[PDB]
Amino acid sequence: LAACLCQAL
Amino acid sequence: LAACLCQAL
């Protein structure tokens, strides 16, 4: 999930 | 942090 946030950012 | 993207958009 952390990586989904990084994608979003 | 996601709200940063919604501001940008």
Chain A residues with at least one Cβ partner in B under 8 Å:
5, 8-9
Long-range Cβ pairs for the range B2-8 (8 Å, 24+): B2/A5, B2/A8, B2/A9, B4/A9, B5/A8, B5/A9
Residue A7 to residues A3, A4, B5, B6, B8, Cα–Cα distance (Å): 6, 5, 11, 14, 15
Q: Give the helix, strand, coil percentages of chain B, each rounded to 5.
A: 80, 0, 20
Chain B residues with at least one Cβ partner in A under 8 Å:
1-2, 4-5
Measure the CA–CA gap between B7 and B9, rounded to whole angstroms: 5
Burial B1-9 (b: 16+ CB within 10 A, else e): eeeeeeeee
Measure the CA–CA gap between B5 and A8, rounded to whole angstroms: 7
Asked if A5 contacts B1 with a C-beta cutoff of 8 angstroms, the reply is yes
Residue A5 to residues A9, B7, B8, Cα–Cα distance (Å): 6, 15, 15
Query: Structure resolution in Å?
Result: 1.0
Measure the CA–CA gap between A4 and B3, rounded to whole angstroms: 14
